[PDB]
Design a protein around this ligand. Sequence first.
Ligand SMILES: Cc1cc2c(cc1C)N(C[C@H](O)[C@H](O)[C@H](O)COP(=O)(O)OP(=O)(O)OC[C@H]1O[C@@H](n3cnc4c(N)ncnc43)[C@H](O)[C@@H]1O)c1[nH]c(=O)[nH]c(=O)c1N2
Ligand SMILES: Cc1cc2c(cc1C)N(C[C@H](O)[C@H](O)[C@H](O)COP(=O)(O)OP(=O)(O)OC[C@H]1O[C@@H](n3cnc4c(N)ncnc43)[C@H](O)[C@@H]1O)c1[nH]c(=O)[nH]c(=O)c1N2
Lengths: 390, 390
Amino acid sequence: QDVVIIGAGAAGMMCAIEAGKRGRRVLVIDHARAPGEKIRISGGGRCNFTNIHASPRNFLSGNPHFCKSALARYRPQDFVALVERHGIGWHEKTLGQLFCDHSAKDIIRMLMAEMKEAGVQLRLETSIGEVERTASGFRVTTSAGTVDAASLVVASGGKSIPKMGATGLAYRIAEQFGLPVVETRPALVPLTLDQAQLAKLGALAGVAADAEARFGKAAFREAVLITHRGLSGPAILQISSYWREGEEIVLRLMPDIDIASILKGMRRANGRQAVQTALADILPRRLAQFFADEAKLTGRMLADLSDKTIDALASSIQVWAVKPAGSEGYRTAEVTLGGVDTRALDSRTMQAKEVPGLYFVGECVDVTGWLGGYNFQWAWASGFVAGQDV
Amino acid sequence: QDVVIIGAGAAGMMCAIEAGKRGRRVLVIDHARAPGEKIRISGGGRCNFTNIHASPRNFLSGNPHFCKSALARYRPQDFVALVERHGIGWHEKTLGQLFCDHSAKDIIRMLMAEMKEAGVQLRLETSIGEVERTASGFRVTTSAGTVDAASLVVASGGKSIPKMGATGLAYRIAEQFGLPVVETRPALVPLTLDQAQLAKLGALAGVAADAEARFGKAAFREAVLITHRGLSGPAILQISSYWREGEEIVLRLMPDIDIASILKGMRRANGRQAVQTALADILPRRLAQFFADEAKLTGRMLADLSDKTIDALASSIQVWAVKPAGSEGYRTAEVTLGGVDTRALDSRTMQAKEVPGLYFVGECVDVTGWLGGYNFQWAWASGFVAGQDV
Ligand SMILES: Cc1cc2c(cc1C)N(C[C@H](O)[C@H](O)[C@H](O)COP(=O)(O)OP(=O)(O)OC[C@H]1O[C@@H](n3cnc4c(N)ncnc43)[C@H](O)[C@@H]1O)c1[nH]c(=O)[nH]c(=O)c1N2
Ligand SMILES: Cc1cc2c(cc1C)N(C[C@H](O)[C@H](O)[C@H](O)COP(=O)(O)OP(=O)(O)OC[C@H]1O[C@@H](n3cnc4c(N)ncnc43)[C@H](O)[C@@H]1O)c1[nH]c(=O)[nH]c(=O)c1N2
């Protein structure tokens, strides 16, 4: 072939299309029974396929400017234009998040059809054994035979959800060719609480609060879910990429309001209501009960509360420090932080600086998006950028 | 005198200080028994004395660029520097809002002391009868006698809270000298609901929700209060300056979350809970009961709810259109929108373009700040700018 791509996911199929459209004869190999398994299950089966605000600040990397070039060369609109062209209903939800109306599968079907038109060859349920450099490019050995190619594209994703065929193949190939690998971790993952915290929040399983999840300078406002394993909801998932074991996150419940103010207002205006009943006018019932207990104010009358006491109560709700036991790991993470070091890669090409004809695209790379369509957009953009050069 | 100022409020005393410090002999006249009565009662008696983000976008005007010059010449830091210099404890709350730690009166005492040092003369409980142009400047007639001055500064505020000595004096003087007056209205004011709306929200008096209050392109996220008169809380107050009679505002309750998502999640995860009980895991109890009733789902089991039904329920909570009966008017507004037309005023001076030696500062002018310290900062800046020229 002129081009062999490992992994028929978001980045791989995009690259395929662009290289097939250039008349380049391309072959895509994947160990799965079906292409784009993550696409398929993503955005709750709807696929949050991009985000209108996609830009360098929405990604974590060791070199923050690395993604600048690809992102500008392939924008959310460009992908939207592609979807509309295939009659795929889409809409925005919150925070710039674009979803399909019908199902993630429309997108798979689409990429598929685009590949068929571009002349690319797809081989599924095919495992990779080795890759060797050759005087002429590369040879890859597979459970189905061997292929030679001038260009080889590593588009095999990251470590999240092993059950779906996630592997670290990309990292093994990077190291094999001497490319550094930025240390990887489960990201956009729920966070665990220890048996004691879980006992204390015993009765709050199922509550869902509007909240800021803060770690130092990073803050996200979205739902926080309390479960029997601990903390999830989009705000946890976001901050989970910034947090590290041993550390505290700070939760601001009902972040747009000032609870101390409210409570003093209710104090004059009514006065003779129980504390937990005043809180229940502000928070879901179970949370109200919880915060009134912890503070030892249950059944106490709102008018008997000093200012100092109210401030402390508010503070317990709006500056709530939690120290997570850990993360739930790769069986539950949406994304892998870290990956093939960017410094070793051509920003406008995706090609290994040290190894002509070798390319790394998509999530396997040390560019990691916030939750909200940013990861798919990076997959798109970098697949596209490689597809122009490959 | 060299300079007579009408109104010993925020803008007037600031101007006084700056003109007194220049050796200009100044006199401040006020019909009140005490200076800075609004300062005194402002920020809940604490005084929200500025906002660190103060800038042109935080103000409504007929000429949006008018305030640019003054704001840059006198910044929140400049005022902070002044407070610290007088040993006045201050802190930030939310949204850039600076407050005193002790009381608004510290600030009054301070401005006072600064005036005494600057040599300015203060006359209180003194009413204004007329102002005439003179070959030499101005003559003002007062319940205490007459004064002549080369410069006359109108710093008499707006129409809000008549009980505290608010009057439209500024507007009467503008018109008398042919300066146009941008149409005035109660702003940062609660909004009223009609008897029918008030009956429907009968049982929600006292609830306080995190919410977005939206009118077209304007949106503010803060607390929304439901009372027996209707709607208040900072988010109402903010949007009230943008809204107009006959129109709708849209309320997004729990704006950082997607309730449709949450509810579908709770549907799989639990399933056999009553709708209103699922909502109570998200909203204060009374709101949960309200939204479940309106939608006619009370006691219904969360797993018997179609997607379409959930979407509609969510939408009722997060795209909630309300048509207000009116505003509560000037007895309750924090600020007056509109005022002396800016186009008629020197942006870098506050002087009437058509009338040498006549100046208009502070709230009487057609520059109106969002809630959060922006109005005091405009008072400061414009008082200061005038005080340099006067
Ligand atoms: C549940 C869930 C939900 C979402 C998301 C993830 C998850 C887990 N994501 C993240 C998103 O799925 C992710 O960023 C992309 O799929 C990455 O694109 P890639 O092409 O790089 O890898 P990708 O996952 O797409 O594909 C990698 C491919 O290589 C194959 N492969 C792996 N190892 C192999 C091997 N050893 N040999 C051969 N082939 C191998 C795989 O089977 C697979 O098809 C997301 N992102 C987003 O922007 N919006 C969203 O809504 C979501 N939602
Ligand atoms: C309850 C409340 C709370 C707040 C606020 C307002 C209110 C009502 N504000 C708004 C703020 O008070 C306002 O913007 C300023 O006081 C305006 O500054 P001025 O100097 O222009 O008028 P200002 O109100 O200060 O003073 C005008 C003066 O002229 C005098 N006067 C009026 N008519 C007269 C007449 N006919 N003859 C002689 N004298 C007359 C008055 O007695 C008064 O002292 C606020 N803003 C903010 O930035 N942060 C905040 O926290 C608050 N909080």
